[PDB]
């Protein structure tokens, strides 16, 4: 019922006069729809959904101008952080930036995001209230000052509360069956085993959208973290996503253990059991 | 739709 627009930005410095790598990708929910990439030989914002391709030369020229503005801004941000931390000319460093909105079942909701990370650590991030900043170290405390004194916070909101939502909404409409579908998990189980007095149980879940999903594992109605081999939810690459949850059990004790598949696109949670 | 305004650290 909830949705999200989010842009992800990745700037990497390249020692010795080299212009940095810059990658920008735009997601609506869990579905990438645009990318910029300094490496690639278009040097325009490229469409990566098929539903955003209908937008006219105006929008594209438009986004391109902004992404080229964003790129140059991050080339500078790199130079600046190298300065703040007194790091050297000879290291490569990484600025990551994510901003975007959340909407509700309503589509007229707000949660706003705009945060940074330098070399894998958090740097500065706009708090939930959208008027305040959280500043990691002194170096970030410098940026907090600049951005309080400049009223950056209040300028963000005009986008986060405004055009972000408006265009999120606009996209969810045109996306149609793509963006607003809720593909259900096809689920089953396995019994491969490399012992006599042990046995392995895998609770599979394939071909589901959106990505978010819950694969609990209870012994006789009590959740178990112990032995519960859970992998990151992975993309099948067709648009759906995959996730399995393993548990090792002793032989002849698999009549006890039950799976629990919660997903957004299910009528009720699907309790599961091994079958001879 | 990207943010129209950019900001420096």
């Amino acid at each position: 019922g909830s949705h999200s627009m989010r842009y992800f930005f990745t700037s990497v410095s390249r020692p010795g006069r080299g212009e940095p790598r810059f990658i920008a990708v735009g997601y609506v929910d869990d579905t990438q729809f645009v990318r910029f990439d300094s490496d690639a030989a278009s040097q325009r914002m490229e469409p990566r959904a098929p539903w955003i391709e209908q937008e006219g030369p105006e929008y594209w020229d438009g986004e391109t101008r902004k992404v080229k503005a964003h790129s140059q801004t991050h080339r500078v941000d790199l130079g600046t952080l190298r300065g703040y931390y007194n790091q050297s000319e000879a290291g490569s460093h990484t600025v990551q930036r994510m901003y975007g909105c959340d909407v509700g079942s309503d589509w007229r909701f707000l949660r706003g995001y705009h945060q940074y990370a330098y070399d894998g650590k958090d740097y500065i991030a706009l708090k939930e209230d959208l008027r305040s900043w959280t500043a990691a170290d002194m170096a970030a405390q410098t940026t907090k000052h600049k951005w309080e004194a400049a009223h950056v916070a209040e300028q963000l909101r005009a986008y986060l509360e405004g055009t972000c939502v408006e265009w999120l909404r606009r996209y969810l409409e045109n996306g149609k069956e793509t963006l607003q579908r809720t593909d259900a998990p096809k689920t089953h189980m396995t019994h491969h085993a490399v012992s006599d007095h042990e046995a392995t149980l895998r609770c599979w879940a394939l071909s589901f959208y959106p990505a978010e999903i819950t694969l609990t594992w209870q012994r006789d109605g009590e959740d178990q973290t112990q032995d519960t081999e859970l992998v990151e939810t992975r993309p099948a690459g067709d648009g759906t996503f995959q996730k399995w949850a393993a548990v090792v059990v002793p032989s002849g004790q698999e009549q006890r253990y039950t799976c629990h598949v919660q997903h957004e696109g299910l009528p009720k949670p699907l309790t599961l059991r091994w079958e001879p | 739709y990207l943010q129209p305004r950019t900001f420096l650290l």
Partner: T-cell receptor
Amino acid sequence: EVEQDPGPFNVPEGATVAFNCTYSNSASQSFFWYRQDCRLEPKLIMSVYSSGNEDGRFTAQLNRASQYISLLIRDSKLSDSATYLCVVNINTDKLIFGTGTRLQVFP
Amino acid sequence: TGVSQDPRHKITKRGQNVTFRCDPISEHNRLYWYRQTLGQGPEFLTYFQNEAQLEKSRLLSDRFSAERPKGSFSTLEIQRTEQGDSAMYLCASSSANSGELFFGEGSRLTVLE
């Protein structure tokens, strides 16, 4: 298009004058009042945020909803005589002036 | 401290080139070229961030070009001048975090036949 009262405001001192300005794109996130003496350059009066910006005789508000920003000079003074310029960003970082609203304060 | 332009006035003969210089406030990254004809508001020409020239308007012809080779001083250059070019050519340095323009006293170009 940044649009603002075309007609010149000729008023006597003591008077209270209100400038209206509106911007076309909802995109704009940065809003300004500049003031310009006749044969000189434009100077910043005021950055315009939602919270009632209360200078001395000057107060401006921003109505993002109706994409409209205003200015209210309380006690008109001979020295307030200048063209008052409305400025917002347009699609990018770039900053775009309205045509200006001229003020002459008689004594 | 502020933005400083040279020259303040230049009279030029129709079809001669002119070159306006601008030395801004160091700390501000962005630098803006506007142009004002008597009675209208300032028309955007082009803005830089450091050495980079992010945007320039339809209104700036072939004849008009502006460099900012380092992050610092910028030049505007009008070629084969026409009477229509006659205007105040305003240089402004600008905060990136706020959008505050800090104008010089401009260069008045009057072009005559």
